[PDB]
Design a protein around this nucleic acid. Structure first.
Lengths: 88, 122, 82, 100, 205, 80, 129, 156, 85
RNA sequence: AAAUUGAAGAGUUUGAUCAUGGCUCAGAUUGAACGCUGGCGGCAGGCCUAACACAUGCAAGUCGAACGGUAACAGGAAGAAGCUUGCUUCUUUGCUGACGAGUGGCGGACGGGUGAGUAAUGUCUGGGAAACUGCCUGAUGGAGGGGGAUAACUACUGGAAACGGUAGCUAAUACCGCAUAACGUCGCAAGACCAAAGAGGGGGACCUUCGGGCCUCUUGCCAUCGGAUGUGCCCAGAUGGGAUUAGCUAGUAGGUGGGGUAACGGCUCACCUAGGCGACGAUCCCUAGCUGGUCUGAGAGGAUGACCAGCCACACUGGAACUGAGACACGGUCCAGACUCCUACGGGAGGCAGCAGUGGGGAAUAUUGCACAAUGGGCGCAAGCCUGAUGCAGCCAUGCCGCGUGUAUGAAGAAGGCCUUCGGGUUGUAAAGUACUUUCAGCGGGGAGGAAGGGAGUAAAGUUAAUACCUUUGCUCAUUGACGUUACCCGCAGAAGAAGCACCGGCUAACUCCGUGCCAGCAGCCGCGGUAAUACGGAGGGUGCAAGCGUUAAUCGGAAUUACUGGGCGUAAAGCGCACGCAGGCGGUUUGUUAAGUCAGAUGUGAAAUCCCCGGGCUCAACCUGGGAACUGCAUCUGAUACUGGCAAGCUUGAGUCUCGUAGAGGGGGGUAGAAUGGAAUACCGGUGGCGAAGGCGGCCCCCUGGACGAAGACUGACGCUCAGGUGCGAAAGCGUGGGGAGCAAACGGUAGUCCACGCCGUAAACGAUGUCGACUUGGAGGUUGUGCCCUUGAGGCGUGGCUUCCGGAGCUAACGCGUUAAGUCGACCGCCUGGGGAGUACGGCCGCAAGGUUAAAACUCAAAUGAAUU
């Protein structure tokens, strides 16, 4: 999946407390890092029909997470858009 | 069929067409005959059914039927037809009423005279 | 204008009227705004053949509604009887 | 950063070459941030089938922790190296210890 | 309207008597009531449920002398009432003026009574009545016009009813030549051989 | 006492006039299900007081244009 | 998921009655406590118990009549698919009175007979008989 | 005392290597007019044998039906693999309103006024079995009172 | 046409139409006068024209030619145009 | 106190069963037609078809108390008289009553017809402000003084006619000024402006030029504010089918200013902005006048809008506007178009979807009737006139209800007919005979009610000068009927003048005998008829109805055969081939808040009718009629907060996140090793064994990992499920491009083909014939991957997650069968089905180079096809 030293750095950079590896703020960052990493391999040979399932699954998961963000607590939501450059 | 599948589309009602369309929602029209002939019925029936092709006022063209015994219906003799399905012949649903302004009723009959238009004997 | 006239409701040779109030430019059995009572020309001995609401009649005539002749004679007979 | 379990068999007529080859490889490993806590020299030994020549070949184990890049360099160097007969390399598999 | 054919053959088709004729002689003295009318009278098939329903309907009808239309209207009016249907229907059927005068005894048979009333010979509260289907109100005095008292058949039917049974709910006065419909008849006051639930389920089909 | 309505706002492209929306909650007659029906209304506006996504209380008055006879009187939940 | 907890409770009761069990356990809730109360005070079980503090569960002591099912006809009416609401006079009558219907009303949950004698109806929960 | 009536007979036949061996089946239900009714299926060589076998089969298994004064307790609904049966206790003197096969099994039970209807197929055996099933699982107020531990007054 | 009353009505309607046409044309000339006056931009002349055209249109609205509402609307419009200057 | 009382099945596929499923029938009803008959009465109904064209007659007039006047009429006077000395007979006099035509006022916009168009401008329900309203009725004031024309008329005259034209002539409640001035209109106010008509009755005093002035009452006129009625306008909801109809719309949406409407408003114009509606179905296409209601149905619903009542539209077709309070005008106008008719060939007249009637269409629906005696409407003070509205008559058994065609006795059980065992039975008290009755028609008498009014004369009060005149309130007198030979009662005579239809194998109530021999024929289904036919024709008998009977047609019921109440989808019709996700639907548990849904109550409304139950009136009923209640609906107010709906704050078990590792035929690209004949399949591990949403996945290494799994530990806080379109993947087959192609094998050893990349096709038994997600349920016997507790006391016993294979309880299942991986008990969501063939076919449409794929009928044809299971 991903090296532990990267996940720990992500959860220490986006975690509002200690070892909150499941708070959505670190979840979205870990998911973006993973998708940016898998993008390099996906750019090759274009023939990975199977591995795209997890791709679309995590895209949908991040979308629903942002939907919850804008449905329950918008402050942190607007506060984290500029950190990672979302919405393209 | 959930309620959502009914709100998005109501119960599709189905209608049954009438078996006799030539009458055009009427009990009997007036028709002019074109051909007079006889045809044998299907197994297990053996006869020579007196039929005829009749031209109607509204422009249709349907086969008719004559019951009883003997007749005089030649060509150009206008008649009336009230309908009625019979199985032993292919798709004919038109019976000719004996005694309608051109058809002589059957003779030598004393029972069920109303169905064949026979006057009262003395 | 608005008047108080009689409407026909019965059968052949058996007339029976219903005193109503309506616009003059309407038919006999046409629309009407209110009922008042009923008149019975063929009433037998001591029958409830003539009923009217004199309060409603006075109220309507207060508005200036005209009055027919038959209802005039009827209310005169009623006021003279009792 | 993954261990690997590399092993190759060399032609018997060039068995005297391997002391230089192993030295070159361990030098490149210690220069490429690798760790070697195990080394084996099984000498000459028979094969299952006489691959590409008679049934004689030398066995040498490395069991190196070096990164995948420098280890992948090994087989590419073996491409233009027609002394070794064949070679086989496995993954870490909880990297092994003293031969025994 | 009124059936004007062979009268006793109807009772033969029923199987029992219907008090149809005068009654000076026994029923069997003139006919083979046990034997079925017509050529084929040597067969008594199993009358089906619908068969026995239709038979009971025809029985009560020919007993009262009413056609299908008026009887169905009476059934409708009875079911229109509150509670039981059969009892109300029988009470209505017994309320006919002709049947009332027949029960009072001024007529030997139903036909004779209906002829008497239809010839302007009966009066209720002094008013002449000509409709044979006039229902009689409770506690309503009836009478007979003096113009017809001189008919011998009147006294004949009078003495015949005197020889006959005496109804309870019907207050009659022989010497006064009149009577009084005291009150509505009772379910028990009827003849128990008249099944009513068959009639109920027949029309309600 | 004055009868008023209350709904959301869809658009405010045209000046001095907004197209509010109201969602009534009606029971379906034939299937007894409760479904929400949304209606639209052209409301005469002044000074372009509100924007998209707001809630507004409106009342009915005389017609002011070809398809606009409603006016707004007060705002609730002024936020976006 | 368990979108209708009342339906889950009701089918667990339906199964416990058919499984010849005495006590059944389910995650409880205030509404299910009210249903348990209106069910016990009608004579179909022995008693209820809301056991647990953070994750409370309800204890249903299934009554028995000669070992047979005391209550065997219980089904949802106002399911999440559609909510049924009945007026005071338009209330139903299960088994011509031998059945009881649970109603949610402004004066809390109560019995259909108590609702009609109080002069108001509400939303039907389930039919019990 | 034990009233009985044949409902229907069928020309059942089972083939043999020679031809058709025409048998005759029958169905009959018996009842006293109160909550004591039992049915019986018959299959023999002739109508008398079939009806007497169905009778002796019905002379036993007396099903006790919970009945009111002269009507059913409450509307019930049953089904046995072929069709459903629905019946409503009607008012007094409205007639035994049933259809075909159910008329016999409802008149023999001594109830004179029940409003009934039978959805589905009209196989006589199945429909009479469904009627008997729906009649058995009925219940009287005192039974519910004893079950709930309450009184007939508390349940009204 | 088919009834003498219809013929008399037609004749009377023709007479009334000619009379109304004459009077309404006069009123139209009087209103166009003050309209051109107020369009010119002078206060005194337009005011005098309005003051002299008020009684004629008033009497025309009074005699049943036009309703009082039209006369009031004309007066209000012309008064607003006058007060503009 | 009542306002209800309510659910029937049968037959039909098989040699025999069950089930699904189509078909038929039993019932009610009609604006019904036809066939056979036909006594009467009462109440209703009567061109649905050609909004096709109409001969002919009548359907809107009235006012002399608003006017000039006099064409007739009858009544006065004055003279001419024939002498009849008052009388017949002439001329004059609007002199009187009356009134042709004309000016003027009112009335043709009411009443009456039809449903062509008209899926919203219309209709129903509930609300709203920005308006008018002649005739009706209250309140407040005026009601002064003048002028010029003109109709009819006279004369002349044009035109075949209609229709005009020219010159004079006279009226007013016709027309036009002046004064007139508010509580009106316009302006912040100051200020300006605005109208008219008299007529009739009498009469004290005067009064007089002889008309009158004057008094009086009656009535009329103008102005304003009102009330009522009616109409105009706006909004909300509801108000057919086709998505084999996916975008529509520049006066278009909004804003400013000008005009116009009785009144707001793109109603219109100029300018400015570029918006507005649309999957909750816009446009387009096809059909329809709508509602109270009517029929059917246990109920929900289904069909429909025939009379009656409310609303809308139209008057030969398309337009336009005038008059008028009100029309965009049915018996008004103008223009264009057609038709018909007249013409003297230049020009004219008309619109029965009014009451009758004619022609044509049709199967089909009627009299070229009487009267305003009643109730209404118009006019007028009143009398009085019109009213084809209406009140009644004429025809039709078209519908509903009522009565009659005899009653009792009567066995010689008559005669005859029929059947027959040749004994007799049947017809059959039925007949004949005897006694009795006369309802209804027919004959002749009497005979209510619809009739209240108005008129003539008188008494009282009101009003004055009046005891005149007028208005009322009483009294007296002749009267006011088309129906109408009235309803009804009485007497006449005599059983007198007065019954047919269908059926008889089963469904279903009724059977025998002759002819006929698969021919004639019958038949709503099964189907009968090949010499004894209970089914055809005939005879008798019987059955069911009744002045009707039967057939046909149409709508509902059974049809649970649209299944929301109340159907299903493993083998009969049906789970998309499979995932992600928009919209949409649903949603864990706690507290607090709001109160939209919800509930309760109240108020208003839901026209009258119709139905319901109490009563009454027609000699009863039909019919009419007095009460209520329903009208299951909608809107405003108050309260309740269990549930949802909206919000705020929460919680961890749902959902997930991290760590340690696990097994991994999971997929792509880069290399390596052999067997057999340069390519291809990687044989021995290999297994109802493992990996995947899925088809599918198999010699050995490098990358991304993805998923799953076990362990406890750390974390977010409901972040979730399903998902029409949409995107993506996609057995196979078929190709396009560039290749070759060891063996192989449609076609011809052997093409393409399988393979290498880029694309397309989107097809399968894509089956587990079982869509996805969750909660709860007697067991046994295994494989499989897992870790723990204690002694591993050798693979140790227990329990624990899964994945996965068979028997099998409860249960479900038409049967087979399934049965913790249910086809069991339930919830959430989305797909598909309504007999078989035609046919997943045509017609399109869309996608694709094409092949093709998706969606997708009707005409027609049959009465079965279809599953399991045994004999």
């Amino acid at each position: 999946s991903l090296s532990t030293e990267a996940t720990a750095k992500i959860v220490s950079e986006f975690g509002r407390d200690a070892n909150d590896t499941g708070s959505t703020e670190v979840q979205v960052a870990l998911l973006t890092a993973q998708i940016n990493h898998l993008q390099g391999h996906f750019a090759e040979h274009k023939k990975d029909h199977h591995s795209r399932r997890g791709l679309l699954r995590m895209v949908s998961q991040r979308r629903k997470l942002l939907d919850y963000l804008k449905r329950k607590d918008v402050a942190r939501y607007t506060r984290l858009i500029e950190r990672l450059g979302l919405r393209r | 069929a959930t309620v959502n599948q009914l709100v998005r589309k109501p119960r599709a009602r189905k209608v049954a067409k009438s078996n006799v369309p030539a009458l055009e929602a009427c009990p009997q029209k007036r028709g002019v005959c074109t051909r007079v002939y006889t045809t044998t019925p299907k197994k297990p029936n053996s006869a020579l059914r007196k039929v005829c092709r009749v031209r109607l006022t509204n422009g249709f063209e349907v086969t008719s039927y004559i019951g009883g015994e003997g007749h005089n219906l030649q060509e150009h003799s206008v008649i009336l037809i009230r309908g009625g399905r019979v199985k032993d012949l292919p798709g004919v649903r038109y019976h000719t009423v004996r005694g309608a302004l051109d058809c002589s009723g059957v003779k030598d009959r004393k029972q069920a005279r109303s169905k064949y238009g026979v006057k009262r004997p003395k | 204008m608005v008047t108080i006239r009689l409407a026909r409701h019965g059968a052949k040779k058996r007339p029976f009227y219903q005193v109503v109030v309506a616009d003059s430019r309407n038919a006999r059995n046409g629309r009407f705004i209110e009922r008042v009572g009923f008149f019975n020309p063929i009433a037998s001995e001591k029958e409830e053949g003539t009923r009217l609401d004199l309060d409603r009649i006075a109220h309507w005539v207060g508005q200036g509604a005209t009055i027919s002749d038959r209802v005039a004679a009827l209310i005169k007979e009623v006021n003279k009887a009792a | 950063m993954r261990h690997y379990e590399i092993v190759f068999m060399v032609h018997p007529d060039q068995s005297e070459q391997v002391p230089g080859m192993i030295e070159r490889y361990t030098a490149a490993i210690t220069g490429a941030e690798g760790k070697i806590h195990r080394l084996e020299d099984w000498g000459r030994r028979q094969l299952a089938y006489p691959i590409n020549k008679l049934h004689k070949a030398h066995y040498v184990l490395m069991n190196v922790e070096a990164p995948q890049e420098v280890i992948d360099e090994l087989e590419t160097t073996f491409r233009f190296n027609d002394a070794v007969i064949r070679s086989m390399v496995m993954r870490t598999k909880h990297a092994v210890t003293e031969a025994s | 309207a009124r059936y004007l054919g062979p009268k006793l053959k109807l009772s033969r088709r029923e199987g029992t008597d219907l008090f149809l004729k005068s009654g000076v002689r026994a029923i069997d003295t003139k006919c083979k009531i046990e034997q079925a009318p017509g050529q084929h009278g040597a067969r008594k098939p199993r009358l089906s449920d619908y068969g026995v329903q239709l038979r009971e309907k025809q029985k009560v009808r020919r007993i009262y002398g009413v056609l299908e239309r008026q009887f169905r209207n009476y059934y409708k009016e009875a079911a229109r009432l509150k509670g039981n249907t059969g009892e109300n229907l029988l009470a209505l059927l017994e309320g006919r003026l002709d049947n009332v005068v027949y029960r009072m005894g001024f007529g030997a048979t139903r036909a004779e009574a209906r002829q008497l009333v239809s010839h302007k010979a009966i009066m209720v509260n002094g008013r002449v009545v000509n409709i044979a289907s006039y229902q009689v109100s409770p506690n309503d005095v009836v009478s007979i016009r003096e113009k017809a008292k001189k008919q011998s058949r009147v006294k004949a039917a009078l003495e015949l009813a005197e020889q006959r049974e005496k109804p309870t709910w019907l207050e009659v006065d022989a010497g006064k030549m009149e009577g009084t419909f005291k009150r509505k008849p009772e379910r028990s006051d009827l003849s128990a051989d008249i099944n009513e639930h068959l009639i109920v389920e027949l029309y309600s089909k | 006492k004055i009868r008023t309505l209350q709904g959301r706002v869809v658009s405010d492209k045209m000046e001095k006039s907004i197209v509010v929306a109201i969602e009534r909650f009606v029971k379906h007659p034939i299937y007894g299900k409760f479904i929400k029906r949304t209606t639209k209304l052209h409301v005469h506006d002044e000074n372009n007081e509100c924007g998209i996504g707001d809630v507004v209380e409106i009342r009915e008055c005389r017609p002011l244009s070809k398809t606009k006879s409603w006016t707004l009187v007060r705002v609730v939940e002024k936020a976006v | 998921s368990m979108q209708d907890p009342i339906a889950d409770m009701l089918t667990r009761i339906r199964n416990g009655q058919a499984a010849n069990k005495a006590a059944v356990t389910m995650p409880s809730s205030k509404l299910k406590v009210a249903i348990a109360n209106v069910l016990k005070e009608e004579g179909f079980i022995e008693d209820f118990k809301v056991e647990g503090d953070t994750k409370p569960e309800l204890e249903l002591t299934l009554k028995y009549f000669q070992g047979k099912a005391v209550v065997e006809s219980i089904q949802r009416v106002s399911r999440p698919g559609l909510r049924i609401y009945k007026r005071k006079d338009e209330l139903p009558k299960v088994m011509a009175g031998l059945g009881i219907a649970v109603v949610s009303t402004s004066k809390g949950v109560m019995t259909d007979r108590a609702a009609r004698q109080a002069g108001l109806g509400g939303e039907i929960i389930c039919y019990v008989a | 005392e034990l009233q009985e009536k044949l409902i229907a007979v069928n020309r059942v036949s089972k083939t043999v290597k020679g031809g058709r061996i025409f048998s005759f089946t029958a169905l009959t239900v018996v009842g006293d007019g109160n909550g004591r009714v039992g049915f019986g299926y018959g299959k023999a060589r002739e109508v008398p044998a079939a009806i007497q076998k169905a009778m002796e089969k019905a002379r036993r298994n007396m099903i006790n039906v919970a009945l009111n004064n002269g009507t059913l307790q409450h509307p019930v609904k049953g089904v046995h693999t072929g069709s459903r049966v629905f019946m409503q206790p009607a008012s007094e003197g409205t007639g035994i309103i049933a259809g075909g096969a159910m008329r016999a099994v409802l008149e023999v039970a001594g109830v004179h006024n029940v409003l009934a209807k039978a959805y589905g197929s009209t196989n006589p055996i199945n429909v009479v079995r469904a009627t008997i099933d729906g009649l058995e699982n009925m219940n009287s107020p005192e039974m519910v009172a004893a079950k709930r531990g309450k009184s007939v007054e508390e349940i009204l | 046409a088919n009834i003498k009353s219809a013929k008399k009505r037609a004749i009377q309607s023709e007479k009334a139409r000619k009379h109304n046409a004459s009077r309404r044309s006069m009123m139209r000339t009087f209103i166009k006068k003050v309209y051109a006056a107020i369009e010119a931009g002078d206060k005194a002349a337009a005011q005098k024209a309005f003051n002299e055209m008020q009684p004629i249109v008033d009497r025309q609205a009074a005699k049943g030619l036009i309703h009082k509402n039209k006369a009031a609307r004309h007066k209000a419009n012309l008064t607003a145009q006058i007060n503009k200057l």
